[PDB]
Amino acid sequence: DVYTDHGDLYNTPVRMLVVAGAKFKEALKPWLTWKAQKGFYLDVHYTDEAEVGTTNASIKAFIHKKYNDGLAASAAPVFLALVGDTDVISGEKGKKTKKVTDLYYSAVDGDYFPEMYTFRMSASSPEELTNIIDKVLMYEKATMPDKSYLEKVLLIAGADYSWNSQVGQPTIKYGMQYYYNQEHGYTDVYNYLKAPYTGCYSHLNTGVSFANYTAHGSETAWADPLLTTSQLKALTNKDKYFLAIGNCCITAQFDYVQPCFGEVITRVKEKGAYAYIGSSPNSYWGEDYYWSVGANAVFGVQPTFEGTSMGSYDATFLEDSYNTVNSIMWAGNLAATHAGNIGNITHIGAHYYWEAYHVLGDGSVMPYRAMPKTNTYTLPASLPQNQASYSIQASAGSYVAISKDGVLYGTGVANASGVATVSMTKQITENGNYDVVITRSNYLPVIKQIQVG
Ligand SMILES: CN(NC(=O)CC[C@H](NC(=O)OCc1ccccc1)C(=O)N[C@@H](CCCCN)C(=O)C(=O)NCc1ccccc1)c1ccccc1
Ligand SMILES: [Ca+2]
Ligand SMILES: [Ca+2]
Ligand code: NA
Ligand code: NA
């Protein structure tokens, strides 16, 4: 089925192709440094290069060739990071949506399924890009002083006379029944199923890890209950950054005449989100229902886990897959596609959904699920020079990276017995303090150093 045909794109060693506007080189450096340190092999290019060019056609041809060449060399990019707004990386009009999309940078072969997990760090200045990066770094390095905010979420079934009861409430209730609850470590599940909505956005200030709104959207707002771009600029959630998902119309229409809601919520300084998932064109009640809960969901009838396929909430909470921000969006789109394949009621079609939904901000983040766990590991006392690999022990599934000065030297995944064989693509030939980073989905990172010589 579509789930086995097009599963989670995450793979290791993690590879990321970055295409950025030339003005962002200095601001982007701390983000590239951290991504290399945590084990991403980066291939970084700018719109001032001959091979990239400055047009949709040249940038797309560049990306497609990089993917195809990487795949031929058993080294396909996993992620595609687009850095800049539409003045530097334009996107193009969707065939189905008639609105801007980044899909065709990611969709390399003939179909409408991406080859890479794509996200856009949309900024209008280096300062706005730094704003996004600082939130990502605090979240991924887990340097926030109030980690308890990670145990809290905000879920809203917004206003619609007919659809709030038929789809909005069943969507949020399914999320709460199976995942956003005390049994999964969430101490505060702020939820608004219907009016009165009064005070529902206060929780974005006090602290939540995740906010999901399903109902009406505009280019610059969650419409009812209302949260505008002007209100996003007045949030006070310093050091308490969230993932937000707007299952609603047009909040991610990132070529709008003003910065769209998804751009503002990620660009705002020391407040708002580290990533946003939303739709560039209108979204639809039926496909958004399946997106969150799974296919085989029925309007006006509460869905259960046994009676639906995998949706975005289900995938998020799988422990061993669908652990990135991009993968949450991917799972939702798979569910909307599966609904069509099995003959459920559909309102607009899968191709439209793959063109519609986007990640703004950093889609490569692995969101925590309530309070992340403390990892176990053993570092060797030394790293002998000129070795093809090193063993590092860490809990099964952890990803280990050895680097220095923001240059990645080697990576490995801990096997089922907790042994990571770190393959050194660059051997250690010089004395120095080498960084060792260990990450795992829903675990706090380990950031240490080993002295050589
Ligand atoms: C943007 N637009 N909306 C539309 O055209 C509707 C698009 C679209 N129609 C739809 O879902 O239809 C389903 C259906 C199929 C078969 C039968 C009956 C229903 C729709 O309502 N989109 C919704 C999101 C629904 C999914 C939530 N999880 C969208 O956010 C929307 O319409 N926003 C408009 C809006 C903007 C500002 C304030 C209020 C409303 C609009 C703008 C101004 C005036 C009227 C419509
Ligand atoms: Ca494809
Ligand atoms: Ca824009
Ligand atoms: Na499901
Ligand atoms: Na998951």
Residue numbers in the entry: 229 to 681
From the paper:
The most relevant are the cysteine peptidases gingipain K (alias Kgp) and R (RgpA and RgpB), which cleave proteins and peptides after lysines and arginines, respectively. Kgp, which is responsible for most of this activity, is a 1723/1732-residue multidomain enzyme encompassing an N-terminal signal peptide, a pro-domain for latency, a caspase-like cysteine peptidase catalytic domain (CD), an immunoglobulin superfamily-like domain (IgSF), between three and five hemagglutinin-adhesion domains, and the C-terminal domain for type-IX secretion. Kgp degrades connective tissue and plasma proteins, for example heme- and hemoglobin-transporting proteins, fibrinogen, fibronectin, plasma kallikrein, immunoglobulins, as well as peptidase inhibitors, thus causing vascular permeability and bleeding. Taken together, these domains form an elongated structure that resembles a tooth: the CD forms the crown with the cusp at its top, and the IgSF, which is a six-stranded antiparallel open β-barrel, shapes the root.
